[PDB]
């Protein structure tokens, strides 16, 4: 294997043909071929005017951006792109596809949570930004316009359902759309401060204790983010820890030369359709969920080698290991998906 480049995307607040020509004009100029793209957020994947109840960003400023023109098929996505939700999200769309989904050709979100493979990479994706007094709060399903202005806050629970991924093997990057919460003060937080002295105030505070747990605990090789509108590099141990900024300003994309370790298609982490699978008594009411008065981590703690096999061949049998495009709706995919959850779940026969 030669290599693979990835390009690494901050956030898009819909501009989709501006990154792409960007991107085609990169792989132009350098004669490089992009694999993938990722995205750290801000997707707002508005399918229609209907879906702009469910967008928070000021009425004065509030535009549909060019989503649309992919989902009705008038633009088509020239290479994969995988994402996660930010702070400018349709976020109505975000919770029916909470478990991950293909929003349009070639447009992958990670739900809520996820890892997932590609070219024998591991990819863990957090979305939503940091707000406290939203860490412990369910979802509730469907959306609905009231929650417009809590759907994309990081819930806690993510922590319990990440924190086990890097047992068997490292994590190769992790996205989070706010930056961990600290590593401000592992790169030139000076020469930050004077592009941006509003940071200052915050201090070493800045960004989310949820995405600074997970980075301790994964140590990925690469952790990315965006959100903040400028670039950053910091290294944290073993992580190299990348900010970018916005489509249409500077340093909005890079590229991430990494080894060709095998070439497949994008698939499903199987370490994490085990945690999927084995917390499904938690996300058992489709309409409140997670359930906390069910304990994630007890829930984890069950599996075993033995039954994790058993778990990837009963996934394999009803979903397969490779992530595939679904054209029914996102509310139909919801309910899909999780049958099929509850359904393998049940399957194991666990006491
Ligand atoms: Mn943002
Ligand atoms: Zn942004």
Redesign the pocket.
Known sequence: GGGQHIAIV??V?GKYREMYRQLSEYEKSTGKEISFVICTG?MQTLRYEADLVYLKVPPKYKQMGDFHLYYEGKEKAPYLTLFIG?N?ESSNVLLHLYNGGFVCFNMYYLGVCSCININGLRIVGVSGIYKSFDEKKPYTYPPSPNDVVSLFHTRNYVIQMLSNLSQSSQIDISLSHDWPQGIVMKGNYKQLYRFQPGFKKDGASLGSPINKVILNTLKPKYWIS??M?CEYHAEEGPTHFIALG?IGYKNAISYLDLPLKQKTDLEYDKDWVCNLIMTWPAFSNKAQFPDLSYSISELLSKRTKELDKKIIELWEKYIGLKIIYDSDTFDIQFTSRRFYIEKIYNELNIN
């Open positions: 901050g956030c607040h801000d930010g400018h965006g959100h509108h916005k």
